């Protein structure tokens with residue numbers, strides 16, 4: 157009687173996001189869907205026990221089945237190394253998975269009509285992605301004690317040098333970088349595939365720098381792959397591609413209506429943080445998806461962390477108000493991609509239905525505390541203005557069952 | 566009967582900004598001030614005739630007299646090389662002057678109450694500066710044909726190597742950089758001196774990058790020079806200093822009231838453009854000042870170009886509506902700095918009076934076309950909504966004479 161969903165790689169997480177992960181699976185997914193679920197436990201304890209092998213196994217699983225949904229994990233530091241008595245300070249799992257699959261991360265904010273945004277003029281979505289390290293890119297730096305010269309060199313592997321400074325007085329710091337064309341091509345392919353997947357135009361952002369020969373490369377690569385492999389595909393989808401230099405891109409974007417993909421490029425180390433900033437809107441309403449340049453493999457993930465403070469409240473038995481939208485949308489976007497790969501329209505209908513239910517619920521006046529403060533301001537919110545974690549999950553469950561019952565008339 | 570203003574280095578410019586430069590000097594300055602004016606003509610023709618020597622002479626003059634006011638010039642390109650039949654494609658004069666004096670450029674928008682700003686929540690000024698090349702900094706880049714390895718090296722001048730990639734398949738692009746501590750110290754000193762000169766707090770913005778050893782240097786240098794040479798100077802001025810990473814700085818700034826100095830740092834090639842963007846507000850209301858790390862030498866300049874299109878209209882005898890505020894404020898800020906160096910309070914009173922007159926005039930409803938459109942929108946402005954270049958200059962003249970006559974009762 158349930159829907160046959162297919163094969164999905166699951167990755168479990170830590171702390172509060174773990175609690176809510178199991179809530180979602182028990183209340184919103186399994187009652188209506190039957191899955192071929194390949195579950196990997198990326199909790200800090202298990203990762204320590206397997207010496208981080210479980211992370212790699214999960215990554216390869218995603219490489220095999222093309223669909224992965226991940227719960228927020230912990231990136232250990234010294235403090236954590238003490239808390240759990242870890243063997244090593246284990247690397248961030250997100251970076252490992254990303255390095256294995258080789259895609260690009262794109263982040264998005266879920267829009268509700270009664271939730272104010274950073275710019276009031278924004279109506280439509282905005283989806284942002286950065287070209288970060290990993291790769292096939294890498295870099296290095298070091299300090300310089302005193303007078304000397306720093307020079308760069310290149311030794312061809314098949315049978316055969318510049319200068320950056322010959323300074324005299326004073327010390328300093330030197331740095332060198334390399335960037336394969338492959339990472340540029342993968343970044344471009346992933347961007348185009350994302351814009352086609354969403355049906356929005358694509359803008360590429362770039363700085364004006366002294367590194368001219370390097371600046372022109374991103375240009376010519378994006379533009380060429382476009383002219384050769386996506387011109388007509390974009391024509392048929394009524395979307396387009398353009399380049400902007402970021403100084404203009406930011407201003408123009410701030411007085412646009414939204415509705416575009418933003419591929420951000422800084423001609424240096426951008427790195428890829430596990431989470432997005434903090435002051436651009438509620439983090440519970442922000443998602444991320446890792447898209448590979450082949451357009452077939454996808455990893456869905458909440459764009460925030462494990463919410464440690466709330467977990468501390470939960471351990472001591474106190475009332476929490478944690479926003480589950482981002483994780484829910486990890487599940488719904490994963491399942492949606494599954495449906496596209498399988499041409500399973502039941503699954504697609506269910507996923508879009510669950511997203512509609514979440515947005516409708518919040519817009520009807522039922523929300524967690526973070527959104528209530530987002531409306532009024534935290535020094536003005538009262539208890540009657542919001543619902544706790546479990547209350548909100550129950551509300552979502554009710555409204556979902558209702559919508560599905562209506563659809564079956 | 567006029568005010569004795571002292572020594573001021575003047576630099577004349579090109580095209581429309583030149584026309585308006587002479588208007589300002591004849592209508593707003595010389596009737597009330599008597600100067601020891603060292604005039605250098607940086608018009609494109611003279612720069613070509615002197616092989617750009619006049620630019621250097623001017624720069625040294627500023628080094629001697631500590632005060633320079635500059636009109637917008639032309640940075641020639643191929644087209645210009647044809648238009649004026651130039652010998653070479655002469656370098657931007659602003660870059661030459663800046664390289665000789667060794668300061669930092671700071672940009673600001675003149676606030677009027679009836680002129681909408683990029684963010685409505687902004688009440689107070691915001692003053693922005695970037696750490697750019699020149700120096701003592703420099704960089705380099707180049708393409709890589711195929712398999713090989715790129716490595717960086719450092720040869721000490723006093724008696725004695727890393728690796729950035731050993732890639733196999735594929736070509737790419739490599740790059741190297743160096744940054745003396747001296748440019749960092751000069752950037753910091755200039756920033757602190759600017760915040761003290763204006764009476765606003767100072768925030769330093771920085772990225773999160775893989776170049777860790779290089780990232781910590783800016784940190785420790787700024788913080789140390791602060792702890793040693795400016796802690797009590799900032800205490801007495803009721804201002805403070807803080808660091809932000811730009812991801813948070815942008816968000817927090819967008820919902821602040823303004824009123825701070827913003828020292829922007831990107832761990833790579835920022836370069837220094839002659840002009841600021843375009844979509845952050847009317848360019849006629851934007852200024853720039855070059856401040857040297859010694860806190861004594863200053864160059865005032867409009868933050869826009871020569872306005873070539875308007876000049877084309879003027880050549881053909883058509884009505885123009887060019888905004889003179891930025892240039893006026895170059896004069897007023899130059900004179901103000903002169904007054905501070907000489908403890909000449911007459912001059913300071915006159916400068917602040919002229920700024921007050923400009924702002925009052927615009928706020929009273931008399932403005933050029935760019936601001937009228939800034940209020941309504943260009944498809945809605947009529948001729949009755951604004952005044953042409955000469956009309957507006959005459960209005961300013963009247964209001965200035967009035968204010969001065971009032972002050973003498």
Ligand SMILES: NC(=O)C1=CN([C@@H]2O[C@H](COP(=O)(O)OP(=O)(O)OC[C@H]3O[C@@H](n4cnc5c(N)ncnc54)[C@H](OP(=O)(O)O)[C@@H]3O)[C@@H](O)[C@H]2O)C=CC1
Nearest residue numbers: 228229230231430431439440460461462463464478479526
């Ligand atoms: N694997 C991953 O994808 C990520 C993992 N992490 C891990 O997350 C853990 C904690 O990171 P942290 O620094 O706490 O950043 P978090 O995003 O985990 O929480 C940060 C703050 O943002 C607000 N917030 C975030 N999500 C929600 C939500 N769903 N509902 C309500 N408020 C929310 C809360 O503010 P308030 O407390 O004011 O309500 C919270 O304290 C660390 O161990 C880190 O390693 C970090 C980033 C992502």
Ligand SMILES: NC(=O)C1=CN([C@@H]2O[C@H](COP(=O)(O)OP(=O)(O)OC[C@H]3O[C@@H](n4cnc5c(N)ncnc54)[C@H](OP(=O)(O)O)[C@@H]3O)[C@@H](O)[C@H]2O)C=CC1
Nearest residue numbers: 637638639640839840848849869870871872873887888935
């Ligand atoms: N030495 C310097 O400080 C600088 C020199 N330049 C030189 O300036 C010349 C032209 O540069 P350009 O690209 O035209 O940029 P400009 O700043 O000279 O003019 C650009 C546009 O901005 C608007 N604008 C700027 N200033 C005003 C003003 N005072 N009143 C009204 N509108 C204004 C106009 O838009 P609209 O036409 O829509 O009204 C104008 O067409 C070039 O030769 C360049 O080399 C460039 C930057 C600074």
Ligand SMILES: CC(C)CCOc1nc(N2C[C@@H]3[C@H](C2)[C@H]3C(=O)O)ccc1C(=O)N[C@@H]1[C@@H]2C[C@@H]3C[C@H]1C[C@@](O)(C3)C2
Nearest residue numbers: 265273274281282284406409410433436437811812815
């Ligand atoms: C347009 C400008 C006000 C810059 C906005 O910047 C960001 N906006 C985000 N959104 C988009 C919008 C919110 C959340 C979503 C929505 O409401 O629908 C998410 C992340 C960044 C972000 O990290 N931006 C950084 C920063 C702004 C630019 C881009 C990038 C790098 C940079 O150096 C320059 C600092």
Ligand SMILES: CC(C)CCOc1nc(N2C[C@@H]3[C@H](C2)[C@H]3C(=O)O)ccc1C(=O)N[C@@H]1[C@@H]2C[C@@H]3C[C@H]1C[C@@](O)(C3)C2
Nearest residue numbers: 402403406674682683690691693815818819842845846
């Ligand atoms: C706060 C964010 C919306 C970024 C704003 O950015 C800028 N605002 C300017 N103002 C300040 C404000 C207007 C004009 C004046 C006023 O109205 O009083 C002038 C220049 C830039 C600018 O060039 N910013 C660029 C860009 C925004 C950030 C800083 C910098 C580099 C970056 O990569 C990141 C792109």
